[PDB]
Amino acid sequence: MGTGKELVLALYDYQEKSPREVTMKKGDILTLLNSTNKDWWKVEVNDRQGFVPAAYVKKLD
């Protein structure tokens, strides 16, 4: 991004189910931190960070 990492769009609401996940609401614009895993991407949701299912977000690119 002009300054940083790529953004992704939340496609669905998702509630964190373990300590390493994070919650997102449908339509949130998240910062993508790590997409090395094909199943779980690490994102920044506002001011919180964690993994969400990769299928639930869409790269803005």
Swiss-Prot record:
Domain of life: Eukaryota
Entry's localization field: Cytoplasm, Cytoskeleton; Cytoplasm, Cell cortex
Record domain SH3: where: 3-61
Disulfide bonds: none
Record note on quaternary structure: Like erythrocyte spectrin, the spectrin-like proteins are capable of forming dimers which can further associate to tetramers. Interacts with ACP1.
Family: Belongs to the spectrin family.
Function summary: Morphologically, spectrin-like proteins appear to be related to spectrin, showing a flexible rod-like structure. They can bind actin but seem to differ in their calmodulin-binding activity. In nonerythroid tissues, spectrins, in association with some other proteins, may play an important role in membrane organization.
Protein name according to UniProt: Spectrin alpha chain, non-erythrocytic 1
Residues shown, of full length: 967 to 1025 of 2477
